[PDB]
Amino acid sequence: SNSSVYTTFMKSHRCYDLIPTSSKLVVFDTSLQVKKAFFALVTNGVRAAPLWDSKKQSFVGMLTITDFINILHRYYKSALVQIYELEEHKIETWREVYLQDSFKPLVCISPNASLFDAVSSLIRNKIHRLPVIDPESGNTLYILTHKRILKFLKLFITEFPKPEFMSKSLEELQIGTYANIAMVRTTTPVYVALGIFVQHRVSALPVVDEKGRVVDIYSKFDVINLAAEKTYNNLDVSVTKALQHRSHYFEGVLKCYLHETLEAIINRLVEAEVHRLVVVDEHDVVKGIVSLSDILQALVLTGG
Amino acid sequence: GQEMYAFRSEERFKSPPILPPHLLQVILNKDTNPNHVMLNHLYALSIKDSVMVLSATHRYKKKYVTTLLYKPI
Amino acid sequence: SMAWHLGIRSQSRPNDIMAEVCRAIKQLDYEWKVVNPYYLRVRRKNPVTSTFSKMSLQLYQVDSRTYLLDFRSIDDEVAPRPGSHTIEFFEMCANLIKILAQ
Numbered sequence: 001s002n003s004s005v006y007t008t009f010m011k012s013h014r015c016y017d018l019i020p021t022s023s024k025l026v027v028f029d030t031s032l033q034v035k036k037a038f039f040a041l042v043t044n045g046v047r048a049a050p051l052w053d054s055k056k057q058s059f060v061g062m063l064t065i066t067d068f069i070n071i072l073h074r075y076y077k078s079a080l081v082q083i084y085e086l087e088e089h090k091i092e093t094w095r096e097v098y099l100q101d102s103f104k105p106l107v108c109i110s111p112n113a114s115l116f117d118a119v120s121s122l123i124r125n126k127i128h129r130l131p132v133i134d135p136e137s138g139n140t141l142y143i144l145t146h147k148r149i150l151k152f153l154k155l156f157i158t159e160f161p162k163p164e165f166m167s168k169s170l171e172e173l174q175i176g177t178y179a180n181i182a183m184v185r186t187t188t189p190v191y192v193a194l195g196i197f198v199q200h201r202v203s204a205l206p207v208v209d210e211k212g213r214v215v216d217i218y219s220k221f222d223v224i225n226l227a228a229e230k231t232y233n234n235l236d237v238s239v240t241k242a243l244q245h246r247s248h249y250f251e252g253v254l255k256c257y258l259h260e261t262l263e264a265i266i267n268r269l270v271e272a273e274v275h276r277l278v279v280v281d282e283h284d285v286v287k288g289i290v291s292l293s294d295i296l297q298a299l300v301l302t303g304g
Numbered sequence: 305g306q307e308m309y310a311f312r313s314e315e316r317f318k319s320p321p322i323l324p325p326h327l328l329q330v331i332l333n334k335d336t337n338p339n340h341v342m343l344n345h346l347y348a349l350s351i352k353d354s355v356m357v358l359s360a361t362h363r364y365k366k367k368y369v370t371t372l373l374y375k376p377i
Numbered sequence: 378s379m380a381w382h383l384g385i386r387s388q389s390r391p392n393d394i395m396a397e398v399c400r401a402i403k404q405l406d407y408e409w410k411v412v413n414p415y416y417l418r419v420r421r422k423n424p425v426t427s428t429f430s431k432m433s434l435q436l437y438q439v440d441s442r443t444y445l446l447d448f449r450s451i452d453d454e455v456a457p458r459p460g461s462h463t464i465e466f467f468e469m470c471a472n473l474i475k476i477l478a479q
């Protein structure tokens with residue numbers, strides 16, 4: 001278990017090796033209208049976009065769905081108090097509104113840096129998007145994510161000199177979160193879910209019934225769908241109605257149990273191509289959550 | 305000692321060269337959203353509602369990335 | 378993002394187009410070389426980073442009435458801070474276009 005096939009693997013592979021042969025990348029000039037910028041994420045089918053400051057001639061940060069959620073939450077509350085600035089903000093001006101005195105520089109990684117360094121930067125900076133930037137040209141090559149990193153790990157270590165801990169359970173490794181679980185109900189208004197997203201900083205919410213059994217899941221991704229409509233005002237509707245608008249059909253929420261081996265969970269997560277499993281009991285009542293961050297944090301501080 | 309005469313080439317650069325070597329004029333990426341010498345070339349979407357969308361594909365070693373810039377006018 | 382167009386198109390006279398890009402280059406303090414009457418190599422010193430960027434302009438005929446100006450970037454040889462060759466290329470283009478077209 002100790003030192004691990006994973007830790008050595010990560011120290012001995014470059015970030016470059018995870019980049020697909022061909023990818024698209026969306027860049028926003030910081031003078032761009034916030035509204036247009038979020039419409040571009042949807043249009044391009046993309047989660048995050050580097051920010052380019054033209055005056056300074058460099059990347060200065062990222063625009064993610066979290067920023068979008070933050071902005072919608074502020075817009076919603078501001079409207080009730082007759083303040084309508086938000087929508088005409090340029091990226092520049094919103095960043096100045098929130099990155100106030102407290103500075104958060106762009107974190108990025110060289111294509112020649114270890115995958116270990118990439119995993120450590122995501123955990124330590126509490127971040128889901130790590131732009132891979134070539135120090136020779138200055139180009140962003142690619143945006144690295146937990147999902148990609150885990151998939152790569154599952155695939156290229158497929159072969160088992162297997163660490164004992166792969167055959168150990170979530171319970172005994174203590175991977176995941178089992179208390180203070182943020183969740184909503186069938187009827188919870190979308191805006192109420194926003195407030196929860198903002199206050200708890202959590203990527204998804206299990207949707208539960210009256211006995212707290214999980215029947216759906218409401219993600220941050222399910223939130224840029226609100227950038228499809230030519231209105232923005234439909235935030236008072238229930239979470240159930242909000243999810244009806246999903247793209248593709250839906251084979252139920254992807255779940256797991258506390259007593260499943262880590263190996264079983266990694267495989268489910270990797271092949272389902274999703275950010276987390278909802279941890280459930282015999283009766284589908286939610287007992288916790290296991291996210292990609294949980295796993296990558298486990299795999300890097302040496303399993304469990 | 306005679307004067308000298310100039311026979312001047314002209315044309316060849318009469319009209320500008322016609323396009324298709326193998327370089328595509330238009331790229332439809334509908335999709336419900338592998339090509340050669342279009343690398344490094346500028347592409348754009350029509351200007352819509354005061355925004356410029358510039359794009360090109362570049363190569364880092366064996367990897368290709370298509371970069372889009374959204375930029376106001 | 379559905380329909381992509383290579384470069385920009387114009388029904389202005391070829392000689393006008395090339396003359397106007399040249400005036401645009403000079404106005405912008407870019408430096409240039411005329412390879413052909415329809416082919417220009419251009420170079421730019423970055424007023425912030427002090428780095429240099431090079432690109433190519435080529436004019437093509439696409440109709441009896443219509444032409445196409447084509448831009449090609451030219452290759453060289455933890456906080457990011459100044460520079461991105463790809464983004465700087467887009468800005469050169471954008472500048473060139475704004476300062477001579479439409």
Ligand SMILES: Nc1ncnc2c1ncn2[C@@H]1O[C@H](COP(=O)(O)OP(=O)(O)OP(=O)(O)O)[C@@H](O)[C@H]1O
Nearest residue numbers: 062064065066067105106107128129130131203220
């Ligand atoms: N690489 C980065 N460097 C600096 N700041 C970043 C970086 N990535 C994201 N941020 C900022 O930090 C915050 C964290 O957001 P995050 O990246 O987790 O959004 P997200 O990846 O879409 O969320 P989630 O993964 O839950 O869907 C955002 O405000 C974002 O603007």
Ligand SMILES: Nc1ncnc2c1ncn2[C@@H]1O[C@H](COP(=O)(O)OP(=O)(O)OP(=O)(O)O)[C@@H](O)[C@H]1O
Nearest residue numbers: 145147217219221222252253254274275276277278
């Ligand atoms: N445990 C789950 N079970 C079923 N569906 C899920 C689950 N988690 C997320 N989804 C759904 O999958 C879609 C994509 O969500 P997810 O957050 O996994 O995508 P993503 O933002 O690209 O992931 P990541 O941030 O890891 O790259 C969403 O519409 C969401 O409702």
Ligand SMILES: Nc1ncnc2c1ncn2[C@@H]1O[C@H](COP(=O)(O)O)[C@@H](O)[C@H]1O
Nearest residue numbers: 176177181182202203204205289291293
């Ligand atoms: N709805 C939720 N309630 C409580 N914790 C969560 C929830 N979603 C994710 N987490 C946990 O919070 C951390 C961030 O996960 P994520 O935001 O999904 O990458 C991980 O440790 C998760 O286990």
Ligand SMILES: [Mg+2]
Nearest residue numbers: 047065066220
């Ligand atoms: Mg997101």
Ligand SMILES: [Mg+2]
Nearest residue numbers: 047145147275
């Ligand atoms: Mg993703």
